[PDB]
Short mmCIF file of C-alpha atoms and ligand atoms in Angstrom, two decimals:
data_model
loop_
_atom_site.label_atom_id
_atom_site.label_comp_id
_atom_site.label_asym_id
_atom_site.label_seq_id
_atom_site.Cartn_x
_atom_site.Cartn_y
_atom_site.Cartn_z
CA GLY A 1 68.06 132.53 76.13
CA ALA A 2 69.63 132.40 79.58
CA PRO A 3 72.96 130.88 78.33
CA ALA A 4 73.44 133.56 75.68
CA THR A 5 72.78 136.30 78.25
CA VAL A 6 75.54 134.86 80.44
CA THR A 7 77.94 134.84 77.46
CA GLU A 8 77.09 138.46 76.67
CA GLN A 9 76.86 139.97 80.16
CA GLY A 10 78.21 137.39 82.65
CA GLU A 11 81.09 138.15 84.98
CA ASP A 12 84.25 136.08 84.63
CA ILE A 13 84.75 134.57 88.08
CA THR A 14 87.86 132.49 87.15
CA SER A 15 91.28 133.35 88.66
CA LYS A 16 92.94 133.01 85.26
CA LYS A 17 90.31 135.34 83.68
CA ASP A 18 89.89 132.90 80.78
CA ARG A 19 86.05 133.25 80.70
CA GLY A 20 85.85 129.55 81.69
CA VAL A 21 83.14 130.22 84.28
CA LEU A 22 80.77 133.12 83.64
CA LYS A 23 78.11 134.20 86.15
CA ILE A 24 74.97 136.27 86.31
CA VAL A 25 73.17 136.93 89.59
CA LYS A 26 69.46 136.34 88.89
CA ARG A 27 68.29 136.93 92.45
CA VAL A 28 70.35 138.67 95.13
CA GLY A 29 70.79 136.71 98.38
CA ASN A 30 70.85 137.70 102.05
CA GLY A 31 73.61 139.12 104.21
CA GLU A 32 77.28 139.19 103.15
CA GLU A 33 78.50 135.68 104.09
CA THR A 34 79.51 133.19 101.41
CA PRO A 35 80.66 129.60 102.08
CA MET A 36 84.11 128.45 103.16
CA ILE A 37 85.96 125.45 101.72
CA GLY A 38 84.71 122.42 103.64
CA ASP A 39 81.26 123.86 104.35
CA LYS A 40 78.28 121.70 103.54
CA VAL A 41 76.26 123.51 100.91
CA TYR A 42 72.54 122.92 100.19
CA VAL A 43 71.25 123.87 96.74
CA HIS A 44 68.53 123.51 94.16
CA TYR A 45 69.75 123.42 90.58
CA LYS A 46 68.94 122.85 86.94
CA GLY A 47 71.62 121.96 84.47
CA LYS A 48 71.88 121.31 80.77
CA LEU A 49 74.36 120.89 77.96
CA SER A 50 74.59 124.03 75.83
CA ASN A 51 74.35 122.09 72.57
CA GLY A 52 72.36 119.10 73.73
CA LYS A 53 69.12 117.58 74.86
CA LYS A 54 70.39 116.59 78.28
CA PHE A 55 68.78 118.26 81.27
CA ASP A 56 69.11 117.53 84.99
CA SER A 57 67.36 119.02 87.99
CA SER A 58 67.23 118.63 91.76
CA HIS A 59 63.55 119.66 91.46
CA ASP A 60 62.76 116.22 90.01
CA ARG A 61 63.63 114.60 93.37
CA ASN A 62 62.00 117.57 95.20
CA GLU A 63 64.95 117.59 97.62
CA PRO A 64 68.09 119.78 97.90
CA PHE A 65 71.42 118.58 96.54
CA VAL A 66 74.09 118.66 99.26
CA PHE A 67 77.87 118.52 98.95
CA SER A 68 81.01 119.74 100.71
CA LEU A 69 82.58 122.78 99.01
CA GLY A 70 85.97 121.98 97.48
CA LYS A 71 85.95 118.24 98.44
CA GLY A 72 85.74 117.15 94.74
CA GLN A 73 82.24 115.62 94.49
CA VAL A 74 81.32 118.20 91.85
CA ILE A 75 83.01 119.85 88.87
CA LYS A 76 85.55 122.65 89.44
CA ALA A 77 83.08 125.27 88.14
CA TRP A 78 80.70 124.43 90.95
CA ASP A 79 83.41 124.83 93.63
CA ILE A 80 84.31 128.20 92.06
CA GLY A 81 80.74 129.38 91.50
CA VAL A 82 78.98 128.27 94.64
CA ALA A 83 81.82 129.77 96.73
CA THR A 84 80.76 133.22 95.35
CA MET A 85 77.07 132.88 96.34
CA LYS A 86 75.12 134.17 99.28
CA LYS A 87 72.28 132.38 101.05
CA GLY A 88 69.13 132.83 98.96
CA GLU A 89 71.03 133.79 95.82
CA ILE A 90 70.07 132.39 92.44
CA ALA A 91 72.77 132.49 89.76
CA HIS A 92 73.31 131.36 86.22
CA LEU A 93 76.70 129.85 85.29
CA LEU A 94 78.03 129.08 81.84
CA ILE A 95 80.97 126.72 81.97
CA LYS A 96 83.65 125.81 79.44
CA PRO A 97 84.83 122.16 79.35
CA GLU A 98 88.11 122.92 81.14
CA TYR A 99 86.06 123.64 84.31
CA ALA A 100 83.63 120.72 83.82
CA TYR A 101 84.40 117.31 82.07
CA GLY A 102 87.11 118.40 79.58
CA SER A 103 88.09 117.13 76.19
CA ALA A 104 87.48 113.53 77.34
CA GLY A 105 83.95 114.15 78.59
CA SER A 106 82.48 111.38 80.76
CA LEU A 107 80.47 109.05 78.54
CA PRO A 108 77.69 108.12 78.27
CA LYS A 109 76.42 111.10 80.23
CA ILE A 110 78.78 113.87 79.10
CA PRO A 111 80.31 114.17 75.60
CA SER A 112 83.69 115.54 74.57
CA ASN A 113 84.21 119.32 74.92
CA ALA A 114 80.79 120.04 76.44
CA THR A 115 79.84 123.51 77.64
CA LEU A 116 77.39 123.33 80.56
CA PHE A 117 74.77 125.75 81.83
CA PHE A 118 73.37 125.78 85.36
CA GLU A 119 70.86 127.67 87.39
CA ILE A 120 71.72 127.29 91.08
CA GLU A 121 69.86 128.46 94.18
CA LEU A 122 72.03 128.46 97.31
CA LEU A 123 69.57 127.50 100.06
CA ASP A 124 71.96 127.25 103.00
CA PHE A 125 75.46 126.37 104.09
CA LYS A 126 76.78 125.04 107.37
CA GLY A 127 80.25 124.58 108.76
CA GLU A 128 81.88 121.16 109.15
C1 LIG B 201 72.09 113.10 87.76
O1 LIG B 201 73.34 112.44 87.50
C2 LIG B 201 74.27 113.23 86.90
C3 LIG B 201 74.13 114.59 86.66
C4 LIG B 201 75.15 115.30 86.01
C5 LIG B 201 76.29 114.63 85.60
C6 LIG B 201 76.39 113.25 85.76
C7 LIG B 201 75.39 112.55 86.45
O2 LIG B 201 75.53 111.20 86.72
C8 LIG B 201 75.26 110.37 85.62
O3 LIG B 201 77.44 112.44 85.37
C9 LIG B 201 78.70 113.04 85.04
C10 LIG B 201 79.64 111.90 84.68
C11 LIG B 201 79.80 110.90 85.82
N1 LIG B 201 79.92 111.58 87.10
C12 LIG B 201 78.99 111.80 88.03
C13 LIG B 201 79.63 112.52 89.00
N2 LIG B 201 80.94 112.63 88.64
N3 LIG B 201 81.12 112.05 87.48
C14 LIG B 201 79.10 113.12 90.25
C15 LIG B 201 78.16 114.30 89.97
C16 LIG B 201 77.49 114.77 91.23
C17 LIG B 201 78.92 115.43 89.30
O4 LIG B 201 78.00 116.39 88.77
C18 LIG B 201 78.44 117.67 88.76
O5 LIG B 201 79.54 118.00 89.10
C19 LIG B 201 77.44 118.64 88.17
C20 LIG B 201 77.08 119.63 89.24
C21 LIG B 201 76.22 119.00 90.35
C22 LIG B 201 74.90 118.52 89.74
C23 LIG B 201 75.19 117.52 88.59
N4 LIG B 201 76.23 117.97 87.65
C24 LIG B 201 76.25 117.55 86.37
O6 LIG B 201 77.26 117.75 85.72
C25 LIG B 201 75.03 116.81 85.77
C26 LIG B 201 74.90 117.13 84.27
C27 LIG B 201 74.49 118.58 84.05
C28 LIG B 201 74.35 118.87 82.55
C29 LIG B 201 73.33 117.95 81.90
C30 LIG B 201 73.70 116.49 82.08
C31 LIG B 201 73.90 116.19 83.56
#
């Protein structure tokens, strides 16, 4: 499925090049601009554990998820990944625990050493 394709063909977008955050562009966005640290970013997403029956989606609430890039509301992988995206882009990210909830996890929601998969659509971003 989608996660396996990211493993096999995804680009490593980490600085350390440790394959901690792998990305496939599923739909190319518009223009050249990508968001700056501090920008408010508006997305739709679906997320799941790799090896789990936990699934989460913005589409359930039928409203975009909004956060400030780099301000710490979301996992490191999201700060790294969303910063690479253009408006209108859809991407798949596969994420090792070091860039998500680590060895500890965050129970009950997130277990120890969980790999996460997301599909993210970057709808818009706006400066502070
Ligand atoms: C729908 O509720 C949740 C969704 C997800 C994780 C959740 C969660 O709350 C229960 O708990 C993680 C542990 C507690 N927590 C929450 C937050 N920080 N720590 C803020 C939260 C915004 C952090 O979430 C993220 O960084 C990522 C990216 C943004 C969208 C949600 N994210 C999740 O990790 C999901 C998670 C995805 C995989 C399947 C289980 C849910």
